[PDB]
């Protein structure tokens, strides 16, 4: 994927590896080496006028 | 079965008139929509992400 990664306050249960949006897109992940939960935010976009 | 309203026989005759001896000032609301939320979609980013 492509995006911005940050820490998150999402209270994952220990069996959950990632979180999904209404659009089915993954929007948070557990890091596989250090087990912190990251929020994924899309890279900023918009029209140019 | 729904009711359409109460019945009223108007007291008609060829020489009877009813005239108002008083009045009420009425204030009544009317609400009209004027706009939508201005939405934009990039079709290429919706379809192809
Ligand atoms: C290796 O990754 C696991 C999680 O998959 C973690 O528990 C462990 O602490 C990691 N080891 C090191 C040395 O970072
Ligand atoms: C007209 O109505 C008001 C109340 O709305 C009342 O105080 C007043 O006395 C009435 N006038 C007459 C001529 O009946």
The residues facing A20 across adjacent strands are A26
Judged on CB neighbours under 10 Å (0-12, 13-18, 19+), B23 is: exposed
* Technique that determined the structure: cryo-EM
d(CA A4, CA A13): 23
Any ligand 1 atom below 6 A from CB of A1: no
Task: Kindly report the protein residue whose alpha carbon is nearest to atom 11 of ligand 2.
Answer: B22
Q: A-side interface with B, Cβ within 8 Å? A: 25, 45, 47
Q: Answer yes or no: do B40 and A45 touch at CB < 8 A.
A: no
Judged on CB neighbours under 10 Å (0-12, 13-18, 19+), A32 is: exposed
């Amino acid at each position: 994927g492509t995006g911005v990664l940050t820490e998150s306050n999402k209270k994952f249960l220990p069996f959950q590896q990632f979180g999904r949006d209404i659009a089915d897109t993954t929007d948070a992940v557990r890091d596989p080496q250090t087990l912190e939960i990251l929020d994924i935010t899309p890279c900023s976009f918009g029209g140019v006028s | 079965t729904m009711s359409l309203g109460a019945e009223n026989s108007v007291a008609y005759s060829n020489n009877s008139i009813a005239i108002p001896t008083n009045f009420t000032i009425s204030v009544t609301t009317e609400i009209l929509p004027v706009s939508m939320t201005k939405t934009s979609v990039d079709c290429t980013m919706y379809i192809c992400g």
